[PDB]
Design a protein around this nucleic acid. Sequence first.
RNA 1: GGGGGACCCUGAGUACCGUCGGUUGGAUAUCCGGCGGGAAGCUGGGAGGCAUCGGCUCCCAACCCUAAAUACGUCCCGAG
RNA 2: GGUUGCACCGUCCGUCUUGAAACACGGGGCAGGGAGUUCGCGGCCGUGGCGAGGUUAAGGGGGUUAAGCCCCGUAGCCGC
RNA 3: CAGUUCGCUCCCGUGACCCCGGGCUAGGGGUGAAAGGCCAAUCGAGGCCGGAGAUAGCUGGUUCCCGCCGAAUCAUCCCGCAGGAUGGCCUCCCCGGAGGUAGGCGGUGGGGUAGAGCACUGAUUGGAGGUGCAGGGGGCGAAAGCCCCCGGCCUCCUGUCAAACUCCGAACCCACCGCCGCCGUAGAUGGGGGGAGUAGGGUGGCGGUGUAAGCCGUCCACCGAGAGGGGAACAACCCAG
RNA 4: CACAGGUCCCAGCUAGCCCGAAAGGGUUUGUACUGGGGCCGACGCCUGCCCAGUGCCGGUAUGUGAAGCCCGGGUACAACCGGGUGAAGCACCGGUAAACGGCGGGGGUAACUAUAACCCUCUUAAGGUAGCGAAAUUCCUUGUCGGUUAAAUGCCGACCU
RNA 5: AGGCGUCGAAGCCCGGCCUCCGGGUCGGGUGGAGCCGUCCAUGAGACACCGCCCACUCCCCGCUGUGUGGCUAACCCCCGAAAGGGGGGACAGCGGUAGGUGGGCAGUUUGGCUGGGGCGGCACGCCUCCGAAAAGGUAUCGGAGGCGCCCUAAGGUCGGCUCAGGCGGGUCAGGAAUCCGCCGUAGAGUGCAAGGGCAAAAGCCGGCCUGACUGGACCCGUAACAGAGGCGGGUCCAGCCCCGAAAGGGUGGCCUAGCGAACCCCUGUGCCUCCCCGGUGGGGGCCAGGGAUGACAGAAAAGCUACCCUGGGGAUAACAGAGUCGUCUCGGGCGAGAGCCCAUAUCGACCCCGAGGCUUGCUACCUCGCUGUCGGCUCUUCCCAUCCUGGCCCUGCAGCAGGGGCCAAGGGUGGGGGUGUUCACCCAUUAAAGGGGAACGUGAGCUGGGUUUAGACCGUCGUGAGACAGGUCGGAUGCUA
Lengths: 59, 94
Amino acid sequence: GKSLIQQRRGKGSPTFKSPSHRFRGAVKYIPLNYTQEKTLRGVVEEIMHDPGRTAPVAR
Amino acid sequence: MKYPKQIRTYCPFCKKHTIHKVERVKKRPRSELSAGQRRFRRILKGYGGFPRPKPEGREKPVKKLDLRFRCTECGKAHTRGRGFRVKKFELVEG
RNA sequence: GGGGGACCCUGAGUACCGUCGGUUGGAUAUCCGGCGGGAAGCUGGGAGGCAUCGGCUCCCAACCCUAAAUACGUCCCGAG
RNA sequence: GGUUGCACCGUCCGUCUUGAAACACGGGGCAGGGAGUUCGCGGCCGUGGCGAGGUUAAGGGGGUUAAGCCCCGUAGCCGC
RNA sequence: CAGUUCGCUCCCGUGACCCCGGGCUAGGGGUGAAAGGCCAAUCGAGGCCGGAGAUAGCUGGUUCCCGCCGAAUCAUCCCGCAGGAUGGCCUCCCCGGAGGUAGGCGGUGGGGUAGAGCACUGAUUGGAGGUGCAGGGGGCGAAAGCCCCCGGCCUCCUGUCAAACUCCGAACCCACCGCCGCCGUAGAUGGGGGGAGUAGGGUGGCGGUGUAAGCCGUCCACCGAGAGGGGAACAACCCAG
RNA sequence: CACAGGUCCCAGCUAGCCCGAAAGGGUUUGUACUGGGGCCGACGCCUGCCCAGUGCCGGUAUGUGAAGCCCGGGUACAACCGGGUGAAGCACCGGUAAACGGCGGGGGUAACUAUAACCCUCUUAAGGUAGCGAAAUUCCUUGUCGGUUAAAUGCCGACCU
RNA sequence: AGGCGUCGAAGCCCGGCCUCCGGGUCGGGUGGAGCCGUCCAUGAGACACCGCCCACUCCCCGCUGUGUGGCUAACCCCCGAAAGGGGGGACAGCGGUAGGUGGGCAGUUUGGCUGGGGCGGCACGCCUCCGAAAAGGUAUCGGAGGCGCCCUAAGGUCGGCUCAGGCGGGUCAGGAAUCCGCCGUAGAGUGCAAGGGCAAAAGCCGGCCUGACUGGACCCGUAACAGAGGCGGGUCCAGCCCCGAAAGGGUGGCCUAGCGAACCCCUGUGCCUCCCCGGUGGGGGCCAGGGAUGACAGAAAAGCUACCCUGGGGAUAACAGAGUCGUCUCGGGCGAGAGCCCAUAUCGACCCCGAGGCUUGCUACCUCGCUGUCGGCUCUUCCCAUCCUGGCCCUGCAGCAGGGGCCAAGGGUGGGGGUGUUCACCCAUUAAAGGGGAACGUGAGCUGGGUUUAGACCGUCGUGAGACAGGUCGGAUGCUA
Ligand SMILES: [Zn+2]
């Protein structure tokens, strides 16, 4: 027999690879060493639309 | 068929007619120390398909009688001719 | 260069055992590898085609090197 | 000897097939090329040597332009 | 013009639109708005070289001349039925040394086919006699049983049968013996060794089967493997090898 | 074929599904309004019964159940024999059908004629509900009736065997 | 049969205790000297004493595991260049081994005969009768049947007896219970099919037995002639026995069916053997018996292909030709009759004999290294068993018409509706609107609607791939003579 779509997705071909170059970047917290025992204040500069996130992003 | 439990017949060891008791051979399982079983176990190991035929449901409707007659004077057993096929075998005191 | 000694030394996850896979004519008696165990060590140890006990015979592993007789012809001489 | 006429006779070649002129298959012409070979084991026959014995293998010596030629070689194999 | 082109006609033509340059996904793998479509004129597993001169019981081919002899398609076994093996039939060589028998006559035995027949087994038309015979139909009687018809069962007469019937029974065939004939010491009968081919047969007479054609066996005469002379041409028919 | 829409399944992240010999990796610069896996297929009205079978999921008191381990016999040692422990899986029990599928068959009636289901007997897990029906599904078949034609194996409407 | 007793005992009281609360064990104390059978009962007797146990349970020590809870220090996961911090945690991961699940992925198998193949059946292993042709042999998916067992007696022997059916006579008693007489060639029985054989028996009734045994030889059949593994059968020698007075018989069933190689394994028995020698455990070998291959002279084993491919086959089907004519079309012989009488104006039962090759079937003779199908259009030609036109005969022929038949093939035999249709049905005309042959004439003349590939839908069948001589939409027609 021939392969399934799920089987072919696991090989990482460009047909199934996520286009992670047109996105705004990963959304992760600042490293925990800054946050532990200290409080940091930030200012919101801009709110943008991330192409693939299903949620707006902010700087 | 009904068969006597004891019969007077020739004894090869006593070289005369004596009383013999009739007994049936019991089929023991294969011994693991025999050369054939050793070869079978050796060739079964490792990768590969099954190396021997596998008959399934192969048996005659009725089987021959494998009887041994034991002399009551010397205690040794022998055979009497070839086996015969009867579905019912009843040893009676007749 | 020869005799004697009562002292010392002679290779370890090795030999070997069980099991699994491969390989072999190697068959309960070939060799290699994995896994779990694993000694003696000179008052010592191994082999002798199933395993053990006694005798007898042969030998000293787990370190290393070694020409000649051999295999081939990208080439040469010579020959059919 | 070349061609042609007359009388009578004659339905091509190869092939499978019971059966081919076949409406069964291969067949435009010519020239060259083209198909039971080698080894090992065994059965048998034609001939020749020795003979209760037969025969050497690998190899060695002599000689030679040379691998030809001469002698040795009892391991082994078959037979008794 | 073209190993998918040309003309007329037709459809989309702001969108899931068309096209270009740079890249990635590689063969039991890729890719697929899913047709087993597409992956360089190749796709129900691409191409190139290698294994490799793969294998087949299947198809085709197999090269000079004369001389001698000269088949078979029938039995048993095989996942055997287009193929093999053991035999039968052919050919070549040798040993051994006196018998051999395809034809005929007579004899000693065996047989159950054709024909015929009913004596067994089973069928088969009518009639006559006997038997109440566990039968049925009526009349008939309290009840014990009668009277007939029909039916059944035996004997006889009458008219018919049999591949799975035989009280009988040929032609004919087979076994053995004696003789005639023929073959054989120029070596038969027989024995040993080498090499095969043959396992699709056909026509014709006979038997079973079938509406018939045909199918299946049997007989070994002819074609197969056979010229010449005839049946108008003809495989098989006649003469003839 | 695809499609927007409907519905079902798995997964709280070192997850679920998938590539690979391994190392590592795709989904993933992702986090249930998400990622992955089926089926139906705009829209309107609806989507009935069945878990006995085959699947899947949960449990598993009990039986069976390999190696290993332990006990007895045997072997001056083993091979070998008997027994105990015995996971998963089967056996067993329960849920599950927008999971694969299924949704029958005989007699007589209510004879205010004849003929229908109200009705009584085997029978299964249950006996096809709303719809549609000579249908791209109907063998008999060119079914029967009505319309279309002078003439209809067509087409349309209807009946339901 | 005594043992206990200052080596301190009955009879009194409470406490803890297990417990079928039956009723037993035990610390302390009033207590200061007695307690049980032995005797009989009890299927088995001593709470007389001395011993080992067996049934449940607990606890003290040591060993062993299984599960549970907790910990960090191996190991893992995150942050960070690092330092280090955090989270999980002896789990997970990894390595080895053991069982299950496992078309996700592979290698394979899915037999043969066959009046093509498939379905069916087994003619695929044996026995009897016919076929079968009077020695032997002889085939078909030829005809009629049986076997894959059973019997310790249904086997061996010896003695005695005679069966089935029928007739006549008998208490209940009758068609049929039991008994007497006669006829009675087997018309019965012999385990089971059929054939053969059996009457002082091979049948029936009794006595005694196990020869249904051991070691061997030769021969016949399967399988003629004419080769054979395995198997079956016959004639004997020896041993030990059975029956009988003896002769004589007995190596299963009166004869012909009831069954099976190699390798491996099990059992019996008594010998040989295992690498320098000896002992032990174990193994190997020789002889005998058994476990089965039914496709029965012996593979272990399911399907689709319409996406299909290859080698072939007219050894073999569909279209067409050929043979045949059961069937089909068309006639004939006889005459029961029906026709008011009257068989023959007309119809003609039951039977019997034919012609044609225009329907279908049967065979498998030519053609599978290709002879392109149905229908329609175009075009040519032929037959007569004549539909009309020409000429006649019979009539249950008044005329007009009809029914039946004869000669006659020059000419004609048309247009439309549904359907791919040929055909059949229907419509309006017409003198009539005939049936057939020509490779079911005619695709190097046409068209391509049906059929018969590759796409797709519905219904049914199948677990599935899929299939349907079931419908449905689409689906190529090459040419320089
Ligand atoms: Zn004895």
